[PDB]
Design an enzyme around this catalytic site. Sequence first.
Site, PDB file in Angstrom:
ATOM      1  N   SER A   1       0.824  -1.204   0.000  1.00 48.38           N
ATOM      2  CA  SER A   1       0.000   0.000   0.000  1.00 48.38           C
ATOM      3  C   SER A   1       0.857   1.253   0.000  1.00 48.38           C
ATOM      4  CB  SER A   1      -0.930   0.012   1.212  1.00 48.38           C
ATOM      5  OG  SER A   1      -1.704   1.198   1.238  1.00 48.38           O
TER       6      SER A   1
ATOM      7  N   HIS B   1      -8.407   2.164   1.469  1.00 49.69           N
ATOM      8  CA  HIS B   1      -8.758   1.608   0.166  1.00 49.69           C
ATOM      9  C   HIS B   1     -10.268   1.544  -0.049  1.00 49.69           C
ATOM     10  CE1 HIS B   1      -4.563   0.838  -0.177  1.00 49.69           C
ATOM     11  NE2 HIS B   1      -4.556  -0.139   0.710  1.00 49.69           N
TER      12      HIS B   1
END
Lengths: 402, 35, 326
Positions: C98, C215
């Site tokens: 990420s 997300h």
Amino acid sequence: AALVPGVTQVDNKSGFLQKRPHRQHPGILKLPHVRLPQALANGAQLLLLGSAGPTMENQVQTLTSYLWSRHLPVEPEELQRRARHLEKKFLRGAVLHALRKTTYHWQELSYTEGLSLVYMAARLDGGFAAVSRAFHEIRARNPAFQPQTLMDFGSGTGSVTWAAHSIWGQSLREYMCVDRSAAMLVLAEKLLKGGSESGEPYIPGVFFRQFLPVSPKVQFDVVVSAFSLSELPSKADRTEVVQTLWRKTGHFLVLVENGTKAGHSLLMDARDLVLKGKEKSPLDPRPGFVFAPCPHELPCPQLTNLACSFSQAYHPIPFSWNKKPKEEKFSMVILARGSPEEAHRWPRITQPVLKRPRHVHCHLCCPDGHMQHAVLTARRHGRDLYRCARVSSWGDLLPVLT
Amino acid sequence: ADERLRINSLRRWRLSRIVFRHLADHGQLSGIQRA
Amino acid sequence: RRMPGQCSVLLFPGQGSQVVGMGRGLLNYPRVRELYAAARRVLGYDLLELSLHGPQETLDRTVHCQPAIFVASLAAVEKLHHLQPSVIENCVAAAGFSVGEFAALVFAGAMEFAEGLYAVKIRAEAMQEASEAVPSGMLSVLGQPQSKFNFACLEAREHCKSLGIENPVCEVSNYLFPDCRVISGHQEALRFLQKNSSKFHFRRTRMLPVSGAFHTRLMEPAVEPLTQALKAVDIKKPLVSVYSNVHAHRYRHPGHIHKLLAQQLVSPVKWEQTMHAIYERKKGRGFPQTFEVGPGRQLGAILKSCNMQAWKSYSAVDVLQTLEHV
RNA sequence: GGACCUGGCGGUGCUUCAUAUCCCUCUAGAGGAGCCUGUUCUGUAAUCGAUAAACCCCGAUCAACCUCACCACCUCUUGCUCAGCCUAUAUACCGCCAUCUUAACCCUGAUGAAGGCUACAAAGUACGUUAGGUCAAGGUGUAGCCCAUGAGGUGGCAAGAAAUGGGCUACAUUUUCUACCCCAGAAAAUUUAGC
Ligand SMILES: C[S@@+](CC[C@H](N)C(=O)[O-])C[C@H]1O[C@@H](n2cnc3c(N)ncnc32)[C@H](O)[C@@H]1O
Ligand code: SF4
Ligand SMILES: [Mg+2]
Ligand SMILES: [Mg+2]
């Protein structure tokens, strides 16, 4: 010659070109890949659970090729000319042996219980697609037609009945099905009842008969014969059946055969027979004209040496040997009561369209009775008509005027 | 040819299967018998 | 060209891999002190002290974990370079989870260290603000074959709609490996999933220790800040094949990293697809070496679940201790 | 109309058993993830169309910031060389592949239709065909366009959603890693075939 570079222009009725793209032009008659009804596909497989092993794959292939390559029975007249020619060359027993070769041995197929299953596994999917394409012709160009009655001479597996239901299921109320074989009639009813001897028919109103009714009083809206006139033993039999079918035709007579020379010649005999009316005072005095695929009633310009056939791609019934989609090459002629709707008939593309850089090859049967090999380009013919031909396909119409 | 090979550096019977069978099946191909 | 087996793939960890003592074992290695000094220069506080000796509660805060993981990952890159020059020389693919993606690009010569730290700092601050904006969280769920994920998300949203909220959010946010996902959204939806796991056919459920829903669209407010931070940065062409998370394919042209990096902020992480794109091959073909450059070993277990054979040649760089005092 | 003969019964049920194919029985997998495709629907002016012709140089691969194809616009042409196009045709030939067709005698019944067995025995013996495929390891002709079916340029085009068909990967404790090649040490429901 229906394409004159710089003279012939697209026919813009309904304000087509302004109101719609070119990919949806009214001459488009292509049918997406045909899928059979699930009830039919399920029924066919269920009936074959008893024996669908490696032997069946060979049997289905043998029947398919045998039927495809069949020739029309040799009439006696053709036989004596061959006999004398061989006689003169030799100059009787020797001629006959030389006649068994170079001549086709035509035999009846007795469709028993065994050979009826093999036929259903070999031609149910293929026959269904060809008839669906033929009916699509009537629907697409005449969407207001809502038949209430249908007859099917030579009803082997009921493919015509199923195809008619898929298109005119909301208006048809009677399906007369004729077939001399008891086994085929027994198989056809099982398929309507989900592939079981006991059940409820999926289509209502289906009538099964073993003999063709012969009476002008009873007249059907759509009479259909698919892959059946090739099983008749002689030209006299074909002549008699087609006369009866026309006498009992109300609106449309749809004849469909294999896409071979034997098939195409067979349909052109029937096409001329109906067009050249011989009955002195028929009960129904209306004339007949070719609704499709021919744009004229003049003799076929391809019957001399070539043939005329069309193709419909379809999804075969899942089996141990059917994996990829197949193509059904067939010959058709549709004869309609009355007179042609208008004078603006359009050429028919009778052969695959070859798309090449900036030019397209179209083989057209024109309204004047002649074939035209046209290579269409934007510079010679125009932006509109080139794009119409670019998107057209085998078996479509080309909207050209003057 | 040779020019092509150089720039690269810088970086059983020859018959159709059936015609083989007819000759093989008729004994016209030496030494090729059927098992 | 190169036979598979002598090349290497570098995997950069992400959120949730921080650990107290991270950085010990890399401090003595070459060039690391200068990286940490530059990190002090750009951030404004001492990452070294916080990472080596921290309460773990300041280290679990979003504003602090991400830069720490970024710097530790790069320090592990220098450690590996010192130990094994050939492995860094023969590197074919790179991938970050990420925030580790920001590290991978920096390893690929698309961005510079200070640029990366500034971007990661702005990203972390904006994400923390967005998490503060609305309550939310994430749940790791391991399913069995009879488990339907979008189905469970639908009733997770139905419940919160019945409670009453504007557009309840609950959707799969991370695809990790077969039948293991991370869903993200409002805490009530995740509690519904936890209590109805049996109906939803979820074998295991574990709330991730995270501040908020990463997300998902809930992090939309953080997108505009990061974009600004990324506008000045001139991203070059990666030297190695560095994979994306939005769609899990190798970045084609540098003019699209600018928007893909901001899209990752509000899009699910396609980790399983990336592992497939890196390691899929026919039976029998050899696999490359794999090095997880950063704290923890989570990507190792994910790779074990995804591709066992690729996991056979997997190793992790120790960022907590060192065998030899260089 | 009377008597008789061969029959066919495209036959129908029951009885018994031979009863293998198919049943039961045995082994093995085949649901789930992730991606690539076949078909459908929707959409565009257009083709998620192709590299004996490009990226890609771990495996593979997508769009490449290539060229050809497509869409919208434009330019040149006696041009290259009495130019140029790969454009069609094996639905022109050949070659190559494939389909389909190609008995006699002797007895019995009065010398009637007709019938003829018994073993410890009573008449029984002897080449064409194809609107076929292939113009990739092969040829011989035939046609088309030549102010464009030739040569260029400027922009665009690089789809979206399902239900089903197929395919590729990992899926472990009777397992995995190292040494050895087997006495060690550490890890952690339908079906489908097959005998
Ligand atoms: C080849 S099948 C046609 C199949 C059918 N049209 C279909 O689409 O499935 C022909 C059928 O016609 C029957 N048939 C043949 N001669 C016939 C005749 N003289 N009169 C009536 N039917 C006949 C056969 O029994 C056979 O079932
Ligand atoms: S469409 Fe033309 S070629 Fe075909 S059968 Fe009719 S007249 Fe003949
Ligand atoms: Mg041909
Ligand atoms: Mg394109």
